[PDB]
Amino acid sequence: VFDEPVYTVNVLENSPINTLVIDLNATDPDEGTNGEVVYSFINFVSNLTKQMFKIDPKTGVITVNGVLDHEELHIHEIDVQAKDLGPNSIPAHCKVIVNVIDINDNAPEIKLLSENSEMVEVSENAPLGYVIALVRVSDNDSGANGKVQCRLQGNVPFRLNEFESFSTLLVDGRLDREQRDMYNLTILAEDSGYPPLRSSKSFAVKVTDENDNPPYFTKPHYQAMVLENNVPGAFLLAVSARDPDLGMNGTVSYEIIKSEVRGMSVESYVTVNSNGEIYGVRAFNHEDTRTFEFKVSAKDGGDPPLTSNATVRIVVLDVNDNTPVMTTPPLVNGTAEVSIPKNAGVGYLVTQIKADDYDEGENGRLTYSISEGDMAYFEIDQINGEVRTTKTFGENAKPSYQITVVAHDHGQTSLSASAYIVIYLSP
Numbered sequence: 341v342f343d344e345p346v347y348t349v350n351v352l353e354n355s356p357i358n359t360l361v362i363d364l365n366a367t368d369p370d371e372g373t374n375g376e377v378v379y380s381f382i383n384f385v386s387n388l389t390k391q392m393f394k395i396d397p398k399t400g401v402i403t404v405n406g407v408l409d410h411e412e413l414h415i416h417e418i419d420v421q422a423k424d425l426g427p428n429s430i431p432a433h434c435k436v437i438v439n440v441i442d443i444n445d446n447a448p449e450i451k452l453l454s455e456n457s458e459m460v461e462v463s464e465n466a467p468l469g470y471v472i473a474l475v476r477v478s479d480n481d482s483g484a485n486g487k488v489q490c491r492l493q494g495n496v497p498f499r500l501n502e503f504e505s506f507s508t509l510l511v512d513g514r515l516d517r518e519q520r521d522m523y524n525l526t527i528l529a530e531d532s533g534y535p536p537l538r539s540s541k542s543f544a545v546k547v548t549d550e551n552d553n554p555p556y557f558t559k560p561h562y563q564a565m566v567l568e569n570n571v572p573g574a575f576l577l578a579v580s581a582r583d584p585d586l587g588m589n590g591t592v593s594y595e596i597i598k599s600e601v602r603g604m605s606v607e608s609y610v611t612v613n614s615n616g617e618i619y620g621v622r623a624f625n626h627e628d629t630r631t632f633e634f635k636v637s638a639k640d641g642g643d644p645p646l647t648s649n650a651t652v653r654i655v656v657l658d659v660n661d662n663t664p665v666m667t668t669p670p671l672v673n674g675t676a677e678v679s680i681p682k683n684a685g686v687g688y689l690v691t692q693i694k695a696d697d698y699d700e701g702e703n704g705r706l707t708y709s710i711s712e713g714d715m716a717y718f719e720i721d722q723i724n725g726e727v728r729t730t731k732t733f734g735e736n737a738k739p740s741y742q743i744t745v746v747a748h749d750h751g752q753t754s755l756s757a758s759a760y761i762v763i764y765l766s767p
């Protein structure tokens with residue numbers, strides 16, 4: 341018969357094999373008994389127990405024959421028997437209990453609930469306290485060996501809120517992609533064993549792009565000078581807008597706003613390249629339009645897209661592309677007849693010549709001269725065009741005088757237009 345009915349023993353988790361759990365004696369014959377004892381396990385409460393322990397059948401010494409895992413099973417209940425060969429006897433049997441004492445063999449486990457596994461992401465300037473990923477820390481031991489706290493690290497714009505079940509990782513700042521497209525976090529964790537076993541976990545935070553900026557122009561108002569009578573399809577000016585966003589959000593497409601210039605349309609005067617290049621679609625003419633301005637848009641692919649527009653002033657410069665035009669006196673094939681008294685004095689105003697020129701400035705300025713003919717008997721004012729007599733006529737003066745007035749301008753190469761004034765002396 342066994343010394344005690346029930347035995348309780350504490351055994352370290354993960355104790356090596358052949359560790360002495362206990363040496364039982366079935367009270368080997370006291371004052372005699374038939375003798376030749378034999379020990380054996382006859383039953384286990386959990387069958388798992390079968391494979392963790394062993395007993396010498398003759399000496400009666402229980403030892404470890406397996407890995408005692410507290411997280412698997414912590415209590416082992418063994419029914420054991422001692423026998424005298426059944427000559428004329430009963431079997432004695434007691435109940436052994438091995439408590440598996442928990443030790444700190446599991447350190448913390450840090451897990452991220454997100455969709456794209458391990459790719460944590462968040463859109464620019466997402467709001468303060470916007471949850472990005474649920475983190476879950478665990479330690480599979482019991483007690484202090486099971487308890488755990490964890491913390492973010494280094495200054496970053498995020499934080500964690502510890503809860504009963506799990507923690508939560510959220511935004512704690514303003515995120516701008518144009519400034520930073522990524523952060524590099526490290527969650528540090530540890531258990532409360534002695535000494536405490538620690539875990540780190542490092543991972544990335546990809547800040548996803550928003551279409552939060554439009555294409556910025558280099559200038560709000562561009563200007564360019566052109567020369568009059570330019571060729572159709574001749575380059576004028578380049579504008580440029582850049583968008584800091586990603587892809588479609590940041591591509592740039594140029595458009596010219598509908599406007600009418602002098603009664604038609606911008607298109608009919610000007611067009612735009614999808615590269616910010618402005619081409620003259622027509623031959624410009626300073627006498628029609630010395631200046632016109634227009635707006636030019638820029639847009640990007642986003643839902644919905646965004647715009648910036650800039651103004652464009654075109655200065656049309658003057659060239660001397662208008663020869664002057666004789667308009668007084670009226671002209672037949674470019675000549676006029678006038679009459680005058682023969683006894684006319686000196687200074688008599690014969691006629692007054694005048695021309696119009698459309699160009700502006702020097703290009704448009706007129707000077708009058710007698711080019712040829714009876715330049716001796718008449719004189720012309722350089723600015724008026726007033727033709728007057730410079731001599732008296734009498735006694736066998738010819739009765740008819742021919743003079744060629746011209747009006748020329750002041751351009752790089754001066755243009756001009758003549759007229760033939762015939763003078764007849766009416767007595």
Ligand SMILES: [Ca+2]
Pocket residue numbers: 353408409410411445
């Ligand atoms: Ca274990």
Ligand SMILES: [Ca+2]
Pocket residue numbers: 353410411442443444445446480481482
């Ligand atoms: Ca353990």
Ligand SMILES: [Ca+2]
Pocket residue numbers: 444445446447448479480481485486531533537
């Ligand atoms: Ca632990």
Ligand SMILES: [Ca+2]
Pocket residue numbers: 464515516517518552553
């Ligand atoms: Ca931004």
Ligand SMILES: [Ca+2]
Pocket residue numbers: 464517518549550551552553584585586
């Ligand atoms: Ca952006």
Ligand SMILES: [Ca+2]
Pocket residue numbers: 551552553554555583584585589590640642646
């Ligand atoms: Ca944009």
Ligand SMILES: [Ca+2]
Pocket residue numbers: 568625626627661662
């Ligand atoms: Ca012109």
Ligand SMILES: [Ca+2]
Pocket residue numbers: 660661662663664697698699703704749751755
């Ligand atoms: Ca002119």
Ligand SMILES: [Ca+2]
Pocket residue numbers: 568626627658659660661662698699700
């Ligand atoms: Ca002109």
Ligand code: NA
Pocket residue numbers: 363364365399400401
């Ligand atoms: Na023994």
